[PDB]
Amino acid sequence: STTEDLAKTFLEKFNYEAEELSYQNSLASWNYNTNITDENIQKMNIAGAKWSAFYEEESQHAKTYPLEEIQDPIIKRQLRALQQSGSSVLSADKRERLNTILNAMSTIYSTGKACNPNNPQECLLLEPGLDDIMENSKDYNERLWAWEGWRSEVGKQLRPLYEEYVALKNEMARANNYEDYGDYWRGDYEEEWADGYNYSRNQLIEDVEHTFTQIKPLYEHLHAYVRAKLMDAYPSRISPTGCLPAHLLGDMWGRFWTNLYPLMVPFGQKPNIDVTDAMVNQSWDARRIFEEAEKFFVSVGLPNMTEGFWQNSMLTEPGDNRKVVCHPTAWDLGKHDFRIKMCTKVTMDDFLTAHHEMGHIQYDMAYAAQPFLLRNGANEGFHEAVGEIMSLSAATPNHLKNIGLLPPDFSEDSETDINFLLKQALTIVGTLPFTYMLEKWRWMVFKGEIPKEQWMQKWWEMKRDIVGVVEPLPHDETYCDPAALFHVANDYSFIRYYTRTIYQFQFQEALCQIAKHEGPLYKCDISNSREAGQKLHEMLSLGRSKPWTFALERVVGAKTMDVRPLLNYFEPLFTWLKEQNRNSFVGWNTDWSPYA
Amino acid sequence: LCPFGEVFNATRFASVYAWNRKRISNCVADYSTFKCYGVSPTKLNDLCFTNVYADSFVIRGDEVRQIAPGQTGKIADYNYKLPDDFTGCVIAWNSNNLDSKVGGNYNYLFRLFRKSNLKPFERDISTEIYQAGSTPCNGVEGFNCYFPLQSYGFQPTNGVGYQPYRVVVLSFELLHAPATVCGPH
Ligand SMILES: *[C@@H]1O[C@H](CO)[C@@H](O[C@@H]2O[C@H](CO)[C@@H](O)[C@H](O)[C@H]2NC(C)=O)[C@H](O)[C@H]1NC(C)=O
Ligand SMILES: *[C@@H]1O[C@H](CO[C@@H]2O[C@@H](C)[C@@H](O)[C@@H](O)[C@@H]2O)[C@@H](O)[C@H](O)[C@H]1NC(C)=O
Ligand SMILES: *[C@@H]1O[C@H](CO)[C@@H](O)[C@H](O)[C@H]1NC(C)=O
Ligand SMILES: *[C@@H]1O[C@H](CO)[C@@H](O)[C@H](O)[C@H]1NC(C)=O
């Protein structure tokens, strides 16, 4: 009797126990997020610790069926996921030391505070306090203390920790046969498959970089336009051929330029479409929104929400004694138990969010028949891409007409479209160079290409060169500014934010084709195209059972990441910016400094 | 006169692996899914049979598909098989309100492993450790050795296909013995 026999029957029994322990973890965690009590924190910890103990134990057992000896690729993909390994291969001392470090970092990020150099008793956490300054201030000096203070106080603490964290992760990664921690992380896009659905870890670098050069033009003109307006925002602070002072960019990092919008609004007298007041006047409540989001998905031929989804979801802030976490999320607890937790308000924003989050649930329902270990998006980027596609079509004036949040005789205003596409680019394309540059730095640090003595030096060389952003004050190697961002300090790969953005518009372009949409790529509304929803579902239901390259091909026709749809989405704005910049510089110096 | 209540409205059903059989003999019978294979249910109150066997267990919504002739699955292969020429009805209904509970109810089991498939209407209640590999278990679970039974785990929040369903499988028997089960005629 063959080793694939043993593997199949081992997995058959694991699936039952795993499904059960994992369901108890989901339930206890859900109990916390919808009722924060110290008792519930306890039940959440106790159950989550049971699940991870079970998993690591079973992950060792899964290793006794060598992958070489398995032929059926559905069993093979199951085992690869279970026997995927890390951190156990270290010594027990270094494994314990690593966790001490990851834990030190993660908590000094959520508790370190920085004090205003002029009001010493005003000491502000990031989480409510500095964040409010970096997202709402228009004062150069106020924004500067906050930005610099958080990077001198919280950042410098993390520097020796991050230093040692790099050493241990690389030891772990090479102990598992990867080149470095980065090569380990790029394994999340790897695929081992015949006839050209393979995808090598080094190709992710190849594809990320090649897509990025195509972005540079659109980013250059977005950059030139905001630099112009920001010059007006903060007169005599910004060079017109220079880079952007990092502390003026709209959040704590310049991760999203989206809060810069009211300083640079293209057509000030065409206020952006806001169906909030319509919703309030038609007496819509939270139930109505979600019903409407359900309607949208049926119209493309996807299922209704399960009856459990309506009993067990938490669609409003409970308003009794209970204390909750309001951040919208879409849970797949297991055992076809699907729920959304969201503190819904009657706003146009929460209307779109319900669509975005119900899209997550549709993905979850679609692959529920796959084996347990394969119930995920095709890779780390697919779930959010699918969610965002829904938010896109539901915001269009056409859909808003058909559901009567916009009068039937309403006519779209091309200037109002430019307003909307600018705000979109401030978020969507703004973040792409930020994201690519961060992971490139991280990836290089792990490879050993950047020495310790040049960490912050190459960081800002890359901020200046790639992102067109320049540090307002000089930072030596006493700083660890990349760790002053959550995902770095909390040890999370960052490239998903880049790939899922590119995936999202690949999906939407492919679906609007199928829906025989007429004009430009924004303004598209896949509503009522059962053909489009069905193509979507044919991939959604794959789970992780096929390589993501095949999964992408199932919807768009190529097995490749491709950024041309993103550029196509923004083509209207792209030509508008070009004409707006007839008398602006485009690109940046990389020599100019506020402090020079 | 027929005791269909104590098989349908029974408080505790059996585990599918140890499925229950009740012989119905010498009475009158007055008759969610309800699927018949050898006979028209609409004509049931008119017919007459020597014996009527009432088989009952619980099962997942997923698995109600398997209590039918010519089916394959853990349930049909390893717990309750119906013969290709089955002549009878499979009545099923959702029992979430009854057989699931907030902590999980785990008193319902099905056999997960067996060295061969059951013959039709065979029952197997052995609990011998299942040796999947060359090296023998010694009553000891693990190392390619498994406890043959597996628990269900019904909670009220599960999706429908994971919820408990109560099943009754009525077989109808025509021997040359005097028929003793009927309705009006
Ligand atoms: C999705 O659900 C709705 C209702 O929850 C279904 O619409 C019908 O709604 C009326 C009253 O609202 C009910 O009496 C009907 O039983 C519902 N069902 C049907 C089939 O009309 C809607 O049809 C559901 N969509 C799908 C694809 O099942
Ligand atoms: C896919 O594979 C192509 C063939 O290369 C050979 O096969 C693969 C599976 C490797 O094991 C390699 O060592 C072999 O030489 C590659 O040429 C091609 O670039 C690959 N494509 C991607 C996206 O990885
Ligand atoms: C919330 O938590 C408390 C104790 O942790 C518990 O008594 C209560 O039933 C829980 N649920 C709700 C809905 O309040
Ligand atoms: C018991 O069985 C009969 C079957 O016809 C049904 O009508 C009845 O409602 C069942 N339940 C009770 C509580 O009587």
Numbering used by the authors:
A (entry chain A): 19 to 516, 616 to 713
B (entry chain E): 335 to 365, 375 to 528
Sentences from the paper on this structure:
The receptor-binding domain (RBD) of the SARS-CoV-2 spike (S) protein binds its cellular receptor angiotensin-converting enzyme 2 (ACE2), thus mediating viral entry. It has been demonstrated that the interaction of a virus with (a) species-specific receptor(s) is a primary determinant of host tropism and constitutes a major interspecies barrier at the level of viral entry. On 5 November 2020, the Danish public health authorities reported 214 cases of humans infected with mink-associated SARS-CoV-2 variants (miSARS-CoV-2) containing a combination of mutations not previously observed. Sequence analysis of the miSARS-CoV-2 "Cluster 5" variant isolated from patients identified four mutations in the spike protein: del 69–70 (a deletion of the His69 and Val70), Y453F (located in the RBD), I692V, and M1229I.
To elucidate at the atomic level the molecular basis for the enhanced binding, we determined the crystal structure of SARS-CoV-2 Y453F RBD bound to mink ACE2 at 3.01 Å resolution. A surface of 1668 Å2 is buried at the binding interface of Y453F RBD/mink ACE2 and is comprised of 18 residues from Y453 RBD and 18 residues from mink ACE2. We especially focused on the residue at ACE2 position 34 as it directly interacts with RBD residues including that at position 453. However, with the mutation to Phe at position 453 in the RBD, the Tyr at position 34 in mink ACE2 does not face the same steric clashes.
